Symmetry: D2
Subunit: 106 residues, 4 copies
């Protein structure tokens, strides 16, 4: 999938997590986000098209995906443990990673 | 790319890191490993064809890529710091992750 | 050190990172934060004095320190790479961990 | 506790996990390992007594504790999920971290 599709998948499922009542819902949404974030890894954002594929900027771009992937990973464990509220809070917290990357690169 | 290509990329660059003489070579190889691992995320292994895409087995399979991706991430920081030997050591230690997944799923 | 002293160390160095001009200042402050957070691990917060040392609650409390330690770890790599701004951003972002734990346990 | 005691704690509980029959035994063991690892953070190893407390070598020493702590953290989540065998395998795998640090610093 393209960057925009992966971004909408990320966006859609974050809201699913907010409105969710149960672990399964959170679980499912986080799984989809993990796949979206991993697939986003190879993308070149439009503001970085003029940069070398292995530039410092591109390195920093992809680092944000590492952070987001790590966070989804942990939130998923929480939801697997049945810690719904705390997985939802981890989801709220990862928005900081979404925002930080958007502020620099979007 | 498919699973097999990602796996060759992973294997090829691990050997490149072993033979490397400077941090640029390690850095370049780890970057290629991270892309390969991230791209591998969505793959279904032949041994798990018969399992649901959202099965416990498939979750455990993808978990190994989380572990791999985290370790590459960290090793790349070490290489960026010019810590060639310790980045090469981190790379040798990664093999545990490679092996553990192969033993169960390959 | 006590929980309070570790908490002040954490507080003080966070501000040091905000005002910092170079990577060495940030590195030094994160190093101090890492030791404070690791030393905090064994503490029982006043709100949880009545809970068993290996209770659900106490596990969740210490989980927040795993999260914080992980974040400092990564931020320190960024500072080591000379990525001052992004290390400072990483430091602003880990405030979410600080606050999440306080909201629940302070 | 001192370095030796923390190392004994780490060693004893690793064996407990190997012999374990259920998730509770592995959970309990990993919990103790986490505390021992976090307490070990501040220690100076006999081989690095002559180095500055904020030396490059001391930084690399403590870095291995970060990686150990992260692995215990993850292994604990697996045990929490009731994935006993997988938690026991994550425990086997972190021996790589134990050994890597001993090779350089013990
Ligand atoms: C879970 C957190 C995230 C959420 C909820 C999210 C969601 C979104 C949304 C709704 C958009 C609007 C455009 C669209 O429809 O795709 C977008 C765009 C974008 N995001 Fe994110 N995103 C997240 C994480 C990230 C991260 C970590 C990065 C960078 C490493 C990033 C980089 C971008 C870029 C470059 C665009 C513009 C794409 C384009 O216009 O071609 N996002 N994202
Ligand atoms: C740096 C670590 C790794 C290395 C060097 C590595 C290396 C390889 C190599 C050389 C192959 C054979 C190439 C081929 O398939 O034609 C392979 C296959 C495979 N690997 Fe890995 N691998 C690594 C990590 C992983 C991880 C973490 C997993 C699972 C989480 C995994 C799962 C698999 C699977 C399922 C196959 C079979 C694909 C097929 O033959 O169709 N590998 N790997
Ligand atoms: C870098 C992030 C953090 C900062 C800057 C911070 C800061 C503080 C400060 C300034 C205090 C007041 C203590 C005093 O006045 O001496 C405090 C107390 C406290 N903090 Fe944190 N904290 C952080 C992270 C955490 C985390 C991760 C946890 C738990 C997982 C936590 C749990 C507590 C508790 C239980 C208290 C109350 C102890 C008391 O009664 O004094 N904090 N913190
Ligand atoms: C879970 C993995 C680990 C296990 C099972 C383990 C086990 C041990 C054992 C059995 C000893 C013998 C010392 C004694 O009993 O007096 C020891 C010592 C030591 N270990 Fe580890 N350890 C682990 C992790 C680590 C790590 C990650 C580091 C480095 C950061 C490390 C550094 C050392 C050092 C420096 C000593 C020497 C202690 C002294 O002589 O005062 N160990 N460890
Ligand atoms: Zn966790
Ligand atoms: Zn590291
Ligand atoms: Zn990083
Ligand atoms: Zn995990």
């Amino acid at each position: 999938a393209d960057l925009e599709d992966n971004m909408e998948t990320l966006n859609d499922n974050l809201k699913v997590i907010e409105k969710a009542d149960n672990a399964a819902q959170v679980k499912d949404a986080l799984t989809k986000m993990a796949a979206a974030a991993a697939d986003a890894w190879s993308a070149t954002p439009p503001k970085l098209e003029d940069k070398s594929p292995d530039s410092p900027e591109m390195h920093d771009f992809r680092h944000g995906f590492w952070i987001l992937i790590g966070q989804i990973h942990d939130a998923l464990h929480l939801a697997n443990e049945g810690k719904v509220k705390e997985a939802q809070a981890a989801a709220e917290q990862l928005k900081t990673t979404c925002n930080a990357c958007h502020q620099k690169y979007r």
